Design a protein around this ligand. Structure first.
Ligand SMILES: *C(=O)[C@@H](NC(=O)[C@H](N)c1ccc(O)cc1)[C@@H]1N[C@@H](C(=O)O)C(C)(C)S1
Ligand SMILES: [Co+2]
Ligand SMILES: [Co+2]
Ligand SMILES: [Co+2]
Ligand SMILES: [Co+2]
Length: 448
């Protein structure tokens, strides 16, 4: 005769329940899995099988923790432990809803977003559009997203990768935010030709402006100062090409070609974010490093487990990784404020003015990466991954936000363009309001 273990529950950081079991009947007694939020975080949480064991998601990957072990008679029943996630359901719900309507408004194939706690790298929200509902039969949801693209599905970052170049060039003392540069409209590098997204003669962009206006040419000129080895070294320190260990099934490691295999043109591509791929989580994790004064903390979604008696064990914190100094990180945060700076005369406006929130030192970076055309082995001309990653706020980092839009026809808010900045605006602005966070001179992107 068998004594069944009672399945543990999955809850958020404040013990708001995401998944829990109730006892019912039909093989007479039947345990019913409940999902009071429906699709809420179902990309992370997953769903249950007919036998009451995990089918996919954390229900499956932590099944042994959640299922326990059945007793007998004499062996006692080890009931399932409760899993406490780092997620905040309120933030998850808002972000997940905003991700869905950015996908609707923008016409993108898909949208995903990640919010990290800036100091600890804990995952506060992780969402994609079209999230399935685990309270319903999965075979009836082939049109739904059943997985977790934010960790499983790498993409080329494009210009949001320029945080690496910016971090290296400041960390090695090779430039400063105010340095006046001379930036041609194109250069020949590594045997290939790199253009800026707008035609221009030599422009007196500051280093700040190179990243604020997202000059590819300016980025490569600065990267020539870093050199491949210090640049590749910093890619590795920012954690690219390597799984984070976040504790979710199906995490991709992405792809960074090791320096021993680069072609002549590789260095002309990586610093502007093409020729490598990363997940949204890796992307957001890079900006977490700069937000946490240069110390990257690998993100984590399991906060703790609670044993059946009620004793709580915290998850072990991952080891700090210093990427750049605190001084360098603070300088990059300030400089990325220029990305969201507005200028009616155009000259001192970054690529993402709609992402700024007046009253706050928002800092971030836009991205537009060309996707590979699967039929030619070559890049599409008009098919993009759109990215934004930012920090709320530069003077007091609390939240890191990463966003990717898969080839939108419009802005995330539905206006003409291809920008994820309005979605950052909405999320970061709402995060400041709800915590009642309180409120200098304009930055120079372009000299004379
Ligand atoms: C980084 O993402 C850069 N983008 C490109 O170089 C890309 N090939 C591209 C060129 C021209 C387009 O019309 C679209 C993509 C720079 N960063 C982008 C950004 O949004 O920040 C641009 C400013 C578009 S160029
Ligand atoms: Co025995
Ligand atoms: Co030209
Ligand atoms: Co267009
Ligand atoms: Co607004």
């Amino acid at each position: 005769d068998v004594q069944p273990a009672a399945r543990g529950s999955i809850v958020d950081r404040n013990n708001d329940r995401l998944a829990f079991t109730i006892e019912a009947r039909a093989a007479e007694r039947q345990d019913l899995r409940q999902y009071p939020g429906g699709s809420l975080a179902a990309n992370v949480v997953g769903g249950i099988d007919w036998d009451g064991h995990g089918l996919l998601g954390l229900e499956d990957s932590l099944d042994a923790v959640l299922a326990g072990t059945d007793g007998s008679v004499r062996h006692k029943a080890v009931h399932g432990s409760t899993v406490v996630l780092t997620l905040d359901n309120d933030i998850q719900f808002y972000v997940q809803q905003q991700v869905q309507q950015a996908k609707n408004l923008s016409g993108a194939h898909n949208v995903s977003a990640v919010v990290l706690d800036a100091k600890t790298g804990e995952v506060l929200a992780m969402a994609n559009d079209n999230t399935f509902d685990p309270s319903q039969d999965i075979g009836r949801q082939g049109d739904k997203q059943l997985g977790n693209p934010a960790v499983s599905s790498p993409f080329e970052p494009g210009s949001v990768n320029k945080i690496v170049a910016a971090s290296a060039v400041i960390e090695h003392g090779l430039s400063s935010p105010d340095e006046v540069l001379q930036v041609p409209g194109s250069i020949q590098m590594g045997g290939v030709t790199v253009h800026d997204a707008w035609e221009h003669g030599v422009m007196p962009y500051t280093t700040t402006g190179v990243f604020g206006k997202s000059s590819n040419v300016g980025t490569l000129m600065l990267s020539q100062r870093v050199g491949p080895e210090r640049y590749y070294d910093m890619l590795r320190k920012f954690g690219l090409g390597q799984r984070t260990g976040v504790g979710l099934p199906g995490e991709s490691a992405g792809l960074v070609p090791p320096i021993d295999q680069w072609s002549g043109s590789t260095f002309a591509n990586l610093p502007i974010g093409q020729g490598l791929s990363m997940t949204l989580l890796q992307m957001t994790g890079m900006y977490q490093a700069i937000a946490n004064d240069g110390v990257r903390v690998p993100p984590r979604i399991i906060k703790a487990t609670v044993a059946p008696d009620g004793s709580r064990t915290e998850e072990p914190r991952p080891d700090d990784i210093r990427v750049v100094s605190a001084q360098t990180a603070q300088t990059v945060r300030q400089m990325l404020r220029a990305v969201v700076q507005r200028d009616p005369m155009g000259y001192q406006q970054g690529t993402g003015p709609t992402a700024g929130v007046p009253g706050y030192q928002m800092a971030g970076k836009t991205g537009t990466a060309q996707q590979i055309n699967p039929g030619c082995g070559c890049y599409f001309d008009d098919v993009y991954w759109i990215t934004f990653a930012g920090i709320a706020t530069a003077d007091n980092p609390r939240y890191v936000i990463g966003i990717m839009l898969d080839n939108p026809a419009r802005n995330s808010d539905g206006a003409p363009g291809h920008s994820a900045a309005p979605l950052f605006h909405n999320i970061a602005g709402w995060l400041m309001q709800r915590e009642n966070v309180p409120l200098g001179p304009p930055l120079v992107l372009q000299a004379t």
